[PDB]
Amino acid sequence: VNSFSGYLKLTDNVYIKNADIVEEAKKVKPTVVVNAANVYLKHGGGVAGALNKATNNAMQVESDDYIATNGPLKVGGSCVLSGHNLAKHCLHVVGPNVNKGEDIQLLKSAYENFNQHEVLLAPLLSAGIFGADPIHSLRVCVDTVRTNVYLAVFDKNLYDKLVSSFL
Ligand SMILES: C[C@@H]1CCN(C(=O)c2ccc3c(c2)nc(CO)n3C)C[C@@H]1C(=O)O
Numbered sequence: 779v780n781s782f783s784g785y786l787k788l789t790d791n792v793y794i795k796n797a798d799i800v801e802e803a804k805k806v807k808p809t810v811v812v813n814a815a816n817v818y819l820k821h822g823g824g825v826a827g828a829l830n831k832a833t834n835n836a837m838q839v840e841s842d843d844y845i846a847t848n849g850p851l852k853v854g855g856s857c858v859l860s861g862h863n864l865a866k867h868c869l870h871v872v873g874p875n876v877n878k879g880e881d882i883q884l885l886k887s888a889y890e891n892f893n894q895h896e897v898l899l900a901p902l903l904s905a906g907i908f909g910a911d912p913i914h915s916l917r918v919c920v921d922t923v924r925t926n927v928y929l930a931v932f933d934k935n936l937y938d939k940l941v942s943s944f945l
Pocket residue numbers: 798799800823824825826828901902904905906907908912930931932933936
């Protein structure tokens with residue numbers, strides 16, 4: 779039993795809700811919140827900009843030190859950093875950005891990072907400003923993640939389309 783509330787159950791391990799992931803995180807304080815990161819951990823917009831703003835830019839400060847030490851992430855890769863005031867940890871995961879010409883096939887590799895954590899709050903990878911079909915993202919998520927994932931879809935209209943179309 780966990781403290782997530784109001785989710786619709788899609789499969790044995792995947793759940794989905796119309797929610798602002800920032801507000802879900804502040805309420806639940808999950809062990810892991812997933813960020814829709816880029817390889818530079820430049821949290822400018824989308825979910826990343828929103829999460830970082832909620833941390834008063836502490837996420838960006840920590841991220842800049844991470845990059846200075848380690849260099850950029852791989853597309854499809856991830857790193858674990860602090861969750862600041864939102865969660866114990868933030869798993870920064872790089873889904874491919876279709877608006878950069880990045881291979882959509884790497885989306886499965888991106889979701890595989892979720893399997894290293896028993897429970898996560900997460901957005902649909904490569905959706906929103908990353909330019910991929912959020913319906914496809916949900917499909918890859920369900921077919922790749924085996925751990926317990928609580929998916930927040932900010933846009934109510936998209937959420938209804940995701941649920942109604944889910945096979
Ligand atoms: C699936 C699709 C992809 C990208 N995406 C975002 O970039 C995103 C997420 C949360 C955000 C946000 C932008 N802007 C704010 C305002 O502070 N918040 C709380 C989520 C979006 C969705 O779930 O509808």
